[PDB]
């Protein structure tokens, strides 16, 4: 029996990927809402590159559709069909703060440029190269957009060309990146189906996207993912000690009792709570976490938490979760490294964390050393590396920040106690 | 084609 919608996409922060709670992404969620409408089960399939994505999409047989933040192209060529558009974007040239802002397309010449092989943007440059014959740019399959942005930020390439939205989601993780200029008109993104004699699937796709635009479902989606967030930045000792005085006193006893109850240092628990909510029991994200220990509704349920907003329940729930995560780690990993690993899993999920341990092993490092694995973690955001892993993309550098941040708060709390 | 993008 069918009853399964096969949707091909990119494994990327904007389209689809795995976080600590399982599958997520603007594309994924939108496609599951659709599958739910049709009364079928969603099957995500990822493509190696865009050329492969399109190769897959048009060979019988053969995925039902591609949800991948694609731009329509020629219409005309009924060989690939596109949907009604769900997200309006604009391609922008991206440069690096410090080097000189290119102002006119012509300025692109004699700079190192990289784009996704097989992309709309490679085609914008291909066109441009006729107007300016000595334009040169590179294109790769071993690279996603999050790679391009990384490369410009660190200085390995000078320019790139990406959809405006891809910035709206990653810019915050790349403090050096800058928009030079818009390069093209605003266009809508659309799903791609194969052509095409049966318009049944397409008619239903577009029926979905039309209504989903009036339910506001697209704007909700647009806000829940293209609202920058993730791991909070280290606040400094000025702010922290102010909160030692102003906030900790209300929660110190909840932290202590949980520590007692679970046989762990209560100040590590408190550090976690600080890096999570700044010790604010009413904190929320549109990512679905809430409370002092920023728990998901699903995780809250599983730890006995009938009210995520009760700081005492949140602190027990999250502490329980952290210590269980740490008991489930391979016996190979000893303390104190065990706890650092446990913080990493608390954030990035065990599965990715195991990815990093394996990547570490193969790399000749010690998978039981937090110093080693934490060098592997950031590579989960590099296509060349994550594509060779079981669960794929993960913004692992933020997990590193997470862990090291909790550890600083942990040190200050240890110093300030400890008579 | 075309197509960064979710
Ligand atoms: Cl410890």
Swiss-Prot record, chain A:
Region (LT domain), start-end ranges: 230-419
GO terms, biological process: cell wall macromolecule catabolic process; cell wall organization; peptidoglycan catabolic process
Spans annotated as Non-LT domain: 1-229
SMART domains the UniProt entry points to: PBPb
One family name in Pfam for this protein: SBP_bac_3
GO CC field: cell outer membrane
GO function terms (MF aspect): peptidoglycan lytic transglycosylase activity
Membrane topology: Peripheral membrane protein
Localization: Cell outer membrane
Coiled-coil boundaries: none
Catalytic residues, chain numbering: 276
EC numbers for this chain: 4.2.2.n1
NCBIfam families for the chain: PRK10859.1
Domain remarks in the Swiss-Prot or TrEMBL record: The N-terminal domain does not have lytic activity and probably modulates enzymatic activity. The C-terminal domain is the catalytic active domain.
Assigned protein family: In the N-terminal section; belongs to the bacterial solute-binding protein 3 family. In the C-terminal section; belongs to the transglycosylase Slt family.
Protein name: Membrane-bound lytic murein transglycosylase F
